[PDB]
Amino acid sequence: SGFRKMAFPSGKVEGCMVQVTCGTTTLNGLWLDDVVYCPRHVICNPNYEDLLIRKSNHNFLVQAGNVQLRVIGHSMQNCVLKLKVDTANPKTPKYKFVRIQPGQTFSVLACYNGSPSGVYQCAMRPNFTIKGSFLNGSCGSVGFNIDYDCVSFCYMHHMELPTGVHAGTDLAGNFYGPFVDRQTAQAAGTDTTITVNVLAWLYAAVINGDRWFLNRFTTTLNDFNLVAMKYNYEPLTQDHVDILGPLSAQTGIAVLDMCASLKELLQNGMNGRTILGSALLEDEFTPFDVVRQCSGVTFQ
Amino acid sequence: SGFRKMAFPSGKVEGCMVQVTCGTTTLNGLWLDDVVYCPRHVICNPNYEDLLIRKSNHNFLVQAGNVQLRVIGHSMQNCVLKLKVDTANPKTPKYKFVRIQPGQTFSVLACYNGSPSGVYQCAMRPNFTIKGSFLNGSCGSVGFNIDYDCVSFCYMHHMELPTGVHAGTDLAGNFYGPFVDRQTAQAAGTDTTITVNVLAWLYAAVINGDRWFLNRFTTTLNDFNLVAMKYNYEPLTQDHVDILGPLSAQTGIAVLDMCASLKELLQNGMNGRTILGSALLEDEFTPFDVVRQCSGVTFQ
Ligand SMILES: *[C@H](O)[C@H](C[C@@H]1CCNC1=O)NC(=O)[C@H](CC(C)(C)C)NC(=O)[C@@H](NC(=O)OCc1ccccc1)C1CC1
Ligand SMILES: *[C@H](O)[C@H](C[C@@H]1CCNC1=O)NC(=O)[C@H](CC(C)(C)C)NC(=O)[C@@H](NC(=O)OCc1ccccc1)C1CC1
């Protein structure tokens, strides 16, 4: 038992990170097959693709450790550079590129100079930012989930907004949210709490022996949603309730009783008590995250 | 910027996890060179020396993916079994076996049937437990730190105590804390807060822009101590103050002044405010961890 913020194991992603140097800018790249994916602003109100046509293949130093990968061709797909190199990465996992939805979580392998520094779990916030940990040179670090043996890359890091939150793209180069890879003013937008995740985390708490917050008040999805709007919570939908099925069925607490639990926590606070070692309602565990961890799902 | 609970990348440990089955008991083992380390209760108020002498090398199916490893010897060092096998692990990294002190952190690569499930950080609490995430079948999972390219193995899991906390050994088989690997009633003992860690996380907060908790008050080492023991915080030594020097100089906040901040936080609480997104005072970040995350250090 116990419950912790758990990342995927990152060896499948570690074996892909490369350093991409161009001019006096260095950042990270993702080497899959004979392609290196990286943020286009390594070539830097830019006209990126005017700036790209003025580039040559030999202008791009790609270093997989202490071995120089040589670029045989390049193209730009939205906000990512794709660098065609002369070597297939023999450590290329089975992979896909996916675009995650907000509320969904993923592991970030933060890198600098091609080298993995640490791994941690993030959620895509409702305002299309992530609360990451990223310094100068961490761009090109990827987020990912694993299913069985296949890596689903969902995030690549590009920028930090003034409120200390982070913004990036999928591996197709399209930003999450209304951000651009340009050093002009832009703000994260107001965030909201991922309600379905909070409820998932309360189930996890029950599955682990935290029941002090429970009651047997019930509620309707409509009455609950009136309260969710009052406290800056995302609306709860019947689809959310459905995904919460397995969790409810394992604990014996109907979704709508646990929603009534959430409501009393929202109106009365937690009153000096902690849930799973936290004094706040945690919203970065999906239902799938709860089920995987509380049942020991592993990955080949 | 940002500060999140960050694990070492796990791929060097991933290449060393195997499945160890004996009788009907399966748990995880660590395969370095031609030796597989695992919890000794895999051969299970027993008598382990008697139980071991009754075992043959063929009783141990050590299973590495789809490559059965032939056992060709065995021995018991305290609570760990050492299974010499006929193949040296080609993916053996540079490694060390270290016994860590309380307050020190490490990453845990939770595993099941020799397959990684996730990675996360933990601290050796002062009562020699850890607050992990471990189910049936997770024994043999290791805790570790990474330095340049060297894996310092420091923990191997064995058991969960009734409070939901977790107990284990170093890789020389010696338990942390008074605990024994048998189904005899044993409780964790009273835990305390790692004061030096809380102060380091206060600095992380400062480096990341949370200053609301600071003040111009100051204190003596003993006066702040007089307060820590009131609140179950552990003594702060002058050795700890020294270790906080780098953080003190980078922020220009003297440690005894940060102690004054923490003192005020202990006597008044957080009163609705968060620090680094927590409403409790976090103690599972060492000064190391802060400097490494807030400066970006990597691992080849
Ligand atoms: C890639 O290594 C870095 C990562 C940044 C640096 C520290 N933390 C990070 O996540 N990315 C950048 O340096 C980008 C470069 C561009 C903009 C993608 C070309 N710059 C930023 O992250 C800057 N953010 C920014 O420009 O956001 C909009 C903004 C808001 C207010 C005033 C001006 C601009 C920020 C580091 C300076
Ligand atoms: C190895 O896979 C497991 C890991 C445990 C299982 C659940 N979570 C974990 O971290 N280890 C065990 O099953 C041990 C086996 C021994 C005792 C180490 C040989 N058993 C336990 O963890 C059990 N706890 C226990 O025996 O603690 C002492 C105790 C306390 C109170 C009353 C009696 C005994 C418990 C999981 C079943």
XYZ file of C-alpha atoms and ligand atoms in Angstrom:
674
model
C 0.000 0.000 0.000
C 0.799 3.689 0.100
C 0.281 6.215 -2.700
C 2.876 8.442 -4.323
C 3.381 10.687 -7.321
C 4.734 7.964 -9.584
C 6.442 8.438 -12.910
C 6.942 5.827 -15.573
C 10.413 4.300 -15.724
C 12.349 6.320 -18.224
C 14.984 4.005 -19.721
C 13.048 3.696 -22.984
C 13.080 7.513 -23.284
C 16.612 8.031 -21.881
C 18.050 6.056 -24.811
C 16.631 8.642 -27.218
C 17.802 11.973 -25.848
C 20.413 13.785 -27.923
C 22.012 17.204 -27.702
C 21.244 19.580 -30.558
C 23.630 22.520 -30.958
C 23.106 25.271 -33.478
C 24.831 28.634 -33.369
C 25.232 29.456 -29.697
C 21.974 27.678 -28.712
C 21.975 24.188 -27.192
C 18.937 22.111 -26.267
C 17.677 18.528 -26.328
C 16.345 16.370 -29.104
C 14.349 13.174 -29.384
C 16.082 10.621 -31.633
C 13.661 8.046 -33.071
C 14.609 5.888 -36.061
C 16.741 8.212 -38.259
C 14.898 11.374 -37.094
C 15.800 13.883 -34.383
C 12.834 15.959 -33.148
C 13.645 19.205 -31.332
C 12.206 22.692 -30.742
C 12.537 24.887 -33.838
C 13.723 27.869 -31.786
C 17.147 26.175 -31.646
C 17.702 27.845 -35.037
C 17.191 31.265 -33.389
C 9.658 38.195 -33.507
C 11.253 35.450 -35.583
C 10.166 34.271 -38.994
C 11.353 30.785 -38.108
C 11.118 29.437 -41.566
C 12.840 32.285 -43.207
C 15.466 31.553 -40.552
C 15.312 27.852 -41.478
C 15.852 28.228 -45.228
C 19.053 30.140 -44.408
C 20.368 27.090 -42.572
C 22.527 24.219 -43.797
C 22.621 20.597 -42.635
C 26.142 21.069 -41.285
C 24.958 23.971 -39.117
C 23.238 21.391 -36.871
C 25.438 19.563 -34.362
C 23.558 16.573 -32.940
C 25.476 14.701 -30.308
C 24.216 11.315 -29.058
C 26.528 11.212 -26.082
C 30.020 11.667 -27.522
C 29.066 10.482 -31.031
C 28.230 13.145 -33.617
C 25.070 12.421 -35.599
C 25.249 14.003 -39.040
C 22.111 15.586 -40.527
C 21.248 14.504 -44.100
C 18.108 16.612 -44.399
C 15.762 18.744 -42.345
C 12.194 19.999 -42.312
C 9.934 21.956 -40.002
C 6.569 20.677 -38.804
C 4.872 23.543 -36.959
C 7.030 24.268 -33.915
C 9.416 21.304 -34.103
C 12.454 20.695 -36.238
C 12.838 17.213 -37.702
C 16.535 16.513 -38.376
C 17.209 13.592 -40.702
C 20.430 11.909 -39.563
C 22.639 9.150 -40.978
C 22.039 6.598 -38.202
C 18.940 4.811 -37.009
C 18.819 4.875 -33.222
C 19.149 1.151 -32.342
C 17.542 1.924 -28.959
C 14.380 3.278 -30.643
C 11.445 1.850 -28.655
C 8.061 1.062 -30.000
C 6.522 4.514 -29.904
C 3.658 6.689 -30.978
C 2.976 10.413 -30.961
C -0.284 11.334 -29.281
C -2.027 14.527 -28.246
C -3.310 14.313 -24.706
C -6.366 15.973 -23.381
C -6.347 18.295 -20.367
C -6.634 16.508 -17.057
C -4.462 13.691 -18.392
C -1.091 12.994 -16.831
C 2.319 12.060 -18.172
C 5.902 11.667 -17.046
C 8.517 14.268 -17.924
C 12.152 13.263 -18.343
C 13.902 16.587 -17.818
C 17.149 16.787 -19.799
C 20.085 19.183 -20.219
C 22.764 18.913 -22.902
C 21.296 15.599 -24.055
C 21.532 14.016 -20.605
C 18.640 12.919 -18.370
C 18.548 14.791 -15.062
C 15.332 13.532 -13.452
C 11.869 12.180 -14.059
C 8.548 13.313 -12.606
C 4.820 13.288 -13.206
C 2.804 16.180 -14.646
C -0.758 16.880 -15.577
C -1.913 18.924 -18.530
C -3.727 21.695 -16.652
C -7.141 22.870 -17.899
C -5.402 26.075 -19.102
C -2.951 24.071 -21.284
C 0.119 24.677 -19.154
C 2.071 22.264 -17.053
C 3.572 22.856 -13.632
C 6.994 21.469 -14.428
C 10.568 21.923 -13.292
C 12.581 23.384 -16.162
C 15.732 25.505 -16.369
C 17.562 27.122 -19.256
C 18.545 24.357 -21.633
C 15.718 21.954 -20.696
C 13.847 22.550 -23.977
C 13.276 19.471 -26.079
C 12.676 17.381 -22.974
C 9.651 15.181 -23.597
C 6.634 14.022 -21.677
C 5.308 10.511 -22.167
C 3.150 7.639 -20.892
C 3.970 3.943 -21.384
C 1.419 1.290 -22.273
C 2.908 -2.205 -21.936
C 5.978 -1.730 -24.155
C 5.033 1.245 -26.354
C 6.093 4.824 -25.637
C 3.382 7.420 -26.284
C 5.151 10.772 -26.431
C 2.708 13.552 -25.764
C 4.790 16.603 -24.803
C 7.932 18.506 -25.736
C 8.998 21.476 -23.666
C 9.509 24.930 -25.230
C 8.911 27.820 -22.839
C 8.216 29.154 -19.367
C 5.407 31.612 -18.716
C 5.886 34.371 -16.119
C 3.851 32.596 -13.426
C 6.490 29.829 -13.360
C 4.333 27.420 -15.407
C 5.471 25.696 -18.552
C 4.185 25.426 -22.092
C 4.988 23.191 -25.003
C 3.858 21.122 -27.948
C 3.023 17.603 -28.885
C 5.565 15.881 -31.108
C 3.661 17.189 -34.147
C 4.817 20.669 -33.178
C 1.417 22.049 -32.263
C 1.323 23.958 -28.987
C -0.987 22.982 -26.188
C -3.054 26.112 -25.562
C -2.735 29.602 -27.110
C 1.008 29.950 -26.744
C 3.584 30.732 -29.431
C 7.339 30.108 -29.418
C 8.061 33.841 -29.454
C 9.470 36.079 -26.705
C 6.377 38.274 -26.517
C 3.945 38.789 -23.659
C 1.435 35.976 -23.149
C -0.237 34.722 -19.979
C -1.335 31.274 -18.869
C -5.050 32.011 -18.469
C -7.098 31.159 -15.348
C -6.688 27.557 -14.178
C -9.361 25.245 -12.767
C -9.125 22.079 -10.678
C -9.513 18.699 -12.369
C -12.515 17.436 -10.404
C -12.587 13.906 -11.808
C -8.936 13.563 -10.727
C -9.643 14.886 -7.229
C -12.323 12.223 -6.851
C -9.943 9.561 -8.198
C -7.444 10.649 -5.544
C -10.084 10.427 -2.801
C -10.875 6.858 -3.888
C -7.140 6.139 -3.734
C -7.234 7.547 -0.187
C -10.082 5.176 0.720
C -8.297 2.218 -0.955
C -5.401 3.116 1.334
C -7.309 3.549 4.626
C -8.137 7.300 4.670
C -11.888 7.412 5.376
C -12.170 10.393 7.752
C -13.545 12.607 4.959
C -16.348 10.220 3.997
C -19.987 10.807 4.877
C -23.177 9.211 3.578
C -24.739 12.340 2.224
C -25.431 11.770 -1.424
C -25.939 14.380 -4.118
C -27.042 14.716 -7.701
C -24.573 15.424 -10.476
C -26.396 18.739 -10.971
C -26.330 19.730 -7.310
C -22.659 18.726 -7.119
C -21.835 20.703 -10.263
C -23.359 23.864 -8.763
C -20.826 23.488 -5.952
C -17.974 22.628 -8.333
C -18.500 25.915 -10.186
C -18.428 27.841 -6.889
C -14.941 26.584 -6.017
C -13.282 26.815 -9.459
C -13.665 23.105 -10.194
C -14.124 21.680 -13.638
C -17.675 20.459 -14.238
C -18.237 16.803 -13.515
C -19.875 14.880 -16.344
C -21.520 11.485 -16.609
C -18.494 10.355 -18.641
C -16.273 11.238 -15.667
C -18.654 9.303 -13.370
C -18.408 6.348 -15.770
C -14.603 6.331 -15.769
C -14.813 6.383 -11.948
C -16.817 3.128 -12.057
C -14.077 0.584 -11.300
C -12.857 2.723 -8.384
C -16.334 3.027 -6.888
C -16.971 -0.698 -7.414
C -13.759 -1.603 -5.586
C -14.462 0.660 -2.576
C -18.253 0.385 -2.433
C -18.686 4.181 -2.421
C -20.942 5.373 -5.223
C -19.536 8.248 -7.269
C -22.280 10.535 -6.048
C -21.530 9.746 -2.371
C -17.897 10.618 -2.989
C -19.022 13.819 -4.717
C -20.925 14.636 -1.520
C -17.673 13.915 0.306
C -15.872 16.364 -1.981
C -18.539 19.016 -1.373
C -18.148 18.989 2.394
C -14.359 19.166 2.024
C -14.812 22.151 -0.302
C -17.163 24.046 2.028
C -15.480 23.155 5.329
C -11.861 22.678 4.318
C -9.834 19.852 5.758
C -9.667 21.250 9.325
C -6.110 20.394 10.299
C -6.216 16.906 8.741
C -4.278 15.445 5.823
C -5.304 13.142 2.985
C -2.548 10.859 1.680
C 0.019 13.137 3.286
C -1.430 16.201 1.567
C -3.262 19.129 3.113
C -4.763 20.057 -0.305
C -7.192 18.286 -2.619
C -4.786 16.806 -5.172
C -5.903 16.852 -8.800
C -2.953 15.367 -10.767
C -3.964 11.685 -10.414
C -6.237 10.383 -13.139
C -8.547 7.438 -12.436
C -6.250 5.304 -14.579
C -3.302 6.482 -12.448
C -5.083 5.346 -9.272
C -5.987 1.924 -10.713
C -2.509 1.296 -12.172
C -0.702 2.159 -8.934
C -3.137 0.582 -6.436
C -3.003 -2.691 -8.437
C 0.670 -2.831 -9.463
C 0.363 -2.617 -13.255
C 3.840 -2.981 -14.794
C 5.292 -2.581 -18.288
C 7.477 -4.882 -20.405
C 12.010 27.375 -12.636
C 9.593 25.129 -10.805
C 10.152 22.549 -8.087
C 8.665 19.088 -8.264
C 9.330 15.781 -6.524
C 11.860 14.400 -8.966
C 13.259 10.892 -9.379
C 16.585 9.921 -10.862
C 16.121 8.456 -14.333
C 15.662 4.748 -13.847
C 17.050 3.083 -16.985
C 20.307 1.967 -15.377
C 18.315 0.157 -12.673
C 15.752 -1.133 -15.195
C 18.431 -3.171 -16.958
C 19.084 -5.031 -13.699
C 15.626 -6.145 -12.510
C 14.780 -9.855 -12.755
C 12.105 -12.230 -11.496
C 13.001 -14.630 -8.671
C 10.595 -17.482 -7.925
C 10.995 -20.143 -5.278
C 8.234 -22.540 -4.371
C 5.165 -20.379 -4.935
C 6.840 -17.131 -3.829
C 7.901 -14.622 -6.471
C 9.633 -11.310 -5.867
C 12.199 -9.105 -7.575
C 15.934 -9.415 -7.709
C 18.828 -7.146 -8.574
C 21.283 -8.662 -11.079
C 24.747 -7.061 -11.005
C 27.656 -8.851 -12.689
C 26.843 -12.579 -12.186
C 24.989 -12.140 -8.858
C 21.251 -11.732 -8.214
C 20.328 -10.034 -4.920
C 16.812 -10.576 -3.571
C 14.937 -10.656 -0.249
C 15.791 -13.815 1.657
C 12.218 -14.482 2.661
C 11.722 -15.707 -0.975
C 12.724 -19.111 0.446
C 9.847 -18.864 2.952
C 8.814 -16.952 12.659
C 11.132 -18.981 10.401
C 14.755 -20.005 10.678
C 16.367 -18.769 7.473
C 19.679 -20.602 7.866
C 17.779 -23.895 8.271
C 15.485 -23.000 5.385
C 18.411 -22.101 3.117
C 20.464 -25.247 3.737
C 17.408 -27.234 2.611
C 17.499 -25.448 -0.748
C 19.210 -26.428 -3.977
C 20.454 -24.124 -6.746
C 17.704 -25.540 -8.973
C 14.949 -24.471 -6.538
C 15.584 -20.880 -7.750
C 14.060 -19.862 -11.080
C 15.710 -16.513 -11.730
C 13.870 -15.180 -14.750
C 15.119 -12.240 -16.842
C 12.426 -11.365 -19.391
C 12.491 -14.398 -21.669
C 15.968 -15.542 -20.610
C 15.987 -17.993 -17.710
C 19.137 -17.468 -15.638
C 20.851 -20.630 -14.411
C 21.705 -20.450 -10.705
C 25.013 -22.115 -9.887
C 25.478 -21.059 -6.278
C 23.830 -19.202 -3.434
C 24.612 -17.608 -0.088
C 22.904 -15.473 2.531
C 24.225 -12.120 3.696
C 21.888 -11.107 6.529
C 18.425 -10.521 5.075
C 19.437 -10.697 1.398
C 20.136 -13.754 -0.675
C 23.002 -13.684 -3.162
C 22.318 -15.870 -6.199
C 25.448 -16.379 -8.265
C 24.339 -17.262 -11.799
C 26.070 -18.407 -14.967
C 25.777 -15.080 -16.859
C 27.132 -11.632 -16.026
C 24.503 -8.957 -16.689
C 25.674 -7.146 -19.860
C 23.699 -4.087 -18.722
C 25.540 -3.801 -15.379
C 26.236 -0.110 -14.707
C 28.900 1.290 -12.499
C 27.510 0.776 -9.050
C 28.116 1.034 -5.345
C 26.293 -0.299 -2.290
C 25.690 2.520 0.153
C 23.898 2.640 3.462
C 22.128 5.974 3.762
C 21.421 8.011 6.879
C 17.981 9.291 7.894
C 16.990 12.511 6.160
C 18.693 11.275 2.988
C 16.548 10.734 -0.121
C 16.608 8.238 -2.978
C 14.527 7.046 -5.878
C 12.517 3.828 -5.795
C 11.903 1.806 -8.953
C 8.855 -0.180 -7.856
C 8.847 -3.517 -9.683
C 6.637 -6.575 -10.023
C 7.607 -9.955 -11.485
C 10.895 -8.369 -12.547
C 9.200 -5.587 -14.518
C 9.287 -1.875 -13.617
C 5.999 -0.328 -12.499
C 7.112 3.248 -11.717
C 9.734 5.482 -10.122
C 9.434 7.975 -7.284
C 11.437 9.579 -4.530
C 11.437 8.767 -0.837
C 13.353 9.731 2.235
C 14.795 7.598 4.979
C 12.555 8.912 7.771
C 14.170 9.341 11.216
C 12.262 6.243 12.452
C 13.979 4.289 9.645
C 10.771 3.705 7.690
C 9.923 5.019 4.256
C 6.612 6.239 2.887
C 6.503 4.178 -0.279
C 4.021 2.640 -2.693
C 4.381 -1.138 -2.507
C 1.934 -3.982 -3.009
C 2.232 -7.765 -2.817
C 5.067 -8.826 -5.128
C 7.120 -5.617 -4.905
C 9.846 -7.027 -2.630
C 13.255 -6.872 -4.211
C 12.527 -3.366 -5.535
C 15.526 -1.153 -4.951
C 16.127 2.422 -3.898
C 19.041 4.258 -5.439
C 20.866 7.476 -6.143
C 22.852 8.372 -9.253
C 26.129 10.306 -9.285
C 27.603 11.181 -12.681
C 27.204 7.672 -14.100
C 27.376 5.559 -10.911
C 24.346 3.936 -9.267
C 24.568 3.936 -5.462
C 22.083 1.246 -4.456
C 20.864 1.988 -0.936
C 17.562 0.195 -0.311
C 15.777 -3.054 -1.043
C 12.159 -3.513 -0.036
C 10.907 -6.279 2.337
C 7.778 -5.392 4.243
C 4.958 -3.026 5.129
C 4.274 -2.071 8.734
C 0.708 -1.659 10.066
C 0.819 2.150 9.688
C 1.171 1.713 5.903
C 4.862 2.614 5.929
C 7.594 0.453 4.501
C 10.714 -1.200 5.816
C 13.758 -2.651 4.179
C 17.461 -3.233 4.041
C 20.552 -1.943 2.369
C 22.130 -4.152 -0.285
C 24.283 -5.814 2.380
C 21.047 -7.156 3.855
C 20.970 -5.127 7.032
C 17.636 -3.600 7.975
C 17.198 0.094 8.496
C 15.669 0.419 11.933
C 14.787 -2.299 14.428
C 12.598 -4.317 12.100
C 12.858 -8.019 11.258
C 11.724 -9.984 8.226
C 9.101 -12.126 9.908
C 5.355 -11.854 10.535
C 5.848 -10.762 14.135
C 4.072 -7.696 15.508
C 6.347 -4.667 15.102
C 5.431 -0.975 14.791
C 7.367 1.850 13.194
C 7.962 4.093 16.171
C 7.373 7.819 16.458
C 8.552 9.836 13.495
C 9.961 13.368 13.529
C 10.315 16.069 10.876
C 13.624 16.418 9.040
C 14.277 20.050 10.011
C 17.283 20.563 7.721
C 15.188 19.323 4.771
C 12.317 21.707 5.521
C 14.771 24.614 5.590
C 16.234 23.498 2.263
C 12.745 23.391 0.736
C 12.113 26.890 2.098
C 15.174 27.969 0.079
C 13.893 26.138 -3.011
C 10.717 28.169 -2.532
C 12.763 31.379 -2.393
C 14.799 30.499 -5.506
C 11.406 29.923 -7.166
C 9.698 33.154 -6.035
C 7.682 32.289 -2.893
C 8.805 34.787 -0.246
C 5.539 35.431 1.621
C 6.764 33.375 4.600
C 10.016 35.324 5.050
C 10.520 37.947 7.772
C 13.243 40.206 9.132
C 13.256 38.366 12.453
C 16.212 36.179 13.383
C 16.962 33.590 16.065
C 19.747 31.635 17.720
C 20.433 27.993 16.933
C 19.316 26.996 20.437
C 16.201 29.201 20.511
C 14.974 27.814 17.192
C 15.864 24.416 18.622
C 13.770 25.117 21.713
C 10.931 25.498 19.186
C 11.711 22.481 16.963
C 11.453 20.038 19.867
C 8.115 21.565 20.821
C 6.810 20.716 17.327
C 8.406 17.269 16.974
C 10.960 18.734 14.565
C 14.299 17.176 14.823
C 17.290 19.057 16.326
C 19.109 21.354 13.927
C 22.881 21.042 14.280
C 25.678 23.338 13.211
C 26.632 20.665 10.650
C 23.213 21.216 9.072
C 23.696 25.012 9.012
C 26.979 24.531 7.131
C 25.263 22.264 4.582
C 22.701 25.047 4.019
C 25.486 27.563 3.275
C 25.304 27.332 -0.533
C 21.536 27.874 -0.440
C 22.011 30.717 2.045
C 24.561 32.489 -0.173
C 22.578 32.044 -3.370
C 19.491 33.593 -1.730
C 21.211 36.021 0.642
C 18.997 34.700 3.457
C 21.027 33.564 6.446
C 20.122 30.139 7.817
C 19.274 31.471 11.280
C 16.958 33.908 9.487
C 15.351 31.070 7.563
C 15.086 29.349 10.952
C 13.190 32.434 12.158
C 10.844 32.040 9.178
C 10.280 28.350 9.921
C 9.761 29.144 13.616
C 6.996 31.588 12.681
C 5.512 29.016 10.316
C 5.481 26.446 13.124
C 3.756 28.757 15.616
C 1.147 30.271 13.275
C 0.616 27.812 10.427
C 0.106 28.636 6.791
C -3.302 30.314 7.224
C -4.564 29.459 3.746
C -1.288 29.903 1.866
C 0.818 27.388 -0.046
C 4.572 26.996 -0.472
C 5.630 25.373 -3.728
C 2.068 24.148 -4.080
C 1.973 22.400 -0.684
C -0.014 23.439 2.376
C 2.292 21.445 4.668
C 5.978 21.925 5.387
C 7.711 19.385 3.103
C 10.744 17.532 4.476
C 11.716 15.069 1.749
C 14.099 17.388 -0.134
C 17.708 17.405 0.952
C 19.945 20.412 0.387
C 21.498 18.256 -2.367
C 18.156 17.802 -4.111
C 17.385 21.533 -4.005
C 20.757 22.560 -5.435
C 20.582 19.803 -8.066
C 17.057 20.640 -9.196
C 17.406 24.413 -8.933
C 20.706 24.221 -10.905
C 19.928 21.461 -13.436
C 22.623 18.858 -12.774
C 22.480 15.835 -15.116
C 23.736 12.250 -15.290
C 25.456 10.712 -18.310
C 14.426 26.077 -23.482
O 15.647 25.622 -22.853
C 13.920 27.321 -22.713
C 13.281 26.851 -21.398
C 12.832 27.971 -20.485
C 14.034 28.635 -19.832
C 13.790 28.531 -18.318
N 12.612 27.697 -18.169
C 12.106 27.332 -19.338
O 11.191 26.539 -19.491
N 12.996 28.141 -23.492
C 13.204 29.458 -23.717
O 14.243 30.035 -23.429
C 12.107 30.253 -24.376
C 12.527 30.611 -25.805
C 11.387 30.834 -26.807
C 10.445 31.962 -26.388
C 10.611 29.546 -26.990
C 11.957 31.209 -28.173
N 11.797 31.478 -23.644
C 11.049 31.457 -22.539
O 10.731 30.406 -21.988
C 10.623 32.782 -21.982
N 9.190 32.864 -21.953
C 8.520 33.684 -22.738
O 9.048 34.364 -23.612
O 7.092 33.734 -22.502
C 6.257 34.846 -22.837
C 6.610 36.165 -22.180
C 5.867 36.611 -21.093
C 6.168 37.842 -20.501
C 7.204 38.630 -21.002
C 7.937 38.190 -22.099
C 7.633 36.968 -22.691
C 11.085 33.010 -20.554
C 12.472 32.446 -20.254
C 12.295 33.930 -20.553
C 7.148 -8.506 -0.501
O 6.566 -8.525 -1.813
C 6.143 -8.001 0.539
C 5.915 -6.490 0.360
C 4.838 -5.938 1.282
C 3.502 -6.571 0.927
C 2.495 -5.427 0.993
N 3.286 -4.204 0.942
C 4.578 -4.456 1.087
O 5.438 -3.611 1.084
N 6.591 -8.335 1.887
C 5.847 -9.093 2.707
O 4.827 -9.634 2.305
C 6.285 -9.268 4.151
C 7.040 -10.590 4.393
C 7.988 -10.592 5.614
C 7.264 -10.415 6.945
C 9.046 -9.510 5.487
C 8.728 -11.911 5.703
N 5.123 -9.155 5.014
C 4.586 -7.949 5.264
O 4.995 -6.905 4.725
C 3.466 -7.950 6.271
N 3.818 -7.134 7.405
C 4.434 -7.635 8.459
O 4.579 -8.834 8.644
O 4.974 -6.689 9.422
C 5.156 -7.088 10.780
C 3.833 -7.272 11.499
C 3.129 -6.168 11.982
C 1.920 -6.351 12.652
C 1.416 -7.635 12.842
C 2.120 -8.734 12.362
C 3.329 -8.555 11.698
C 2.143 -7.383 5.761
C 2.068 -7.174 4.251
C 1.434 -8.411 4.888
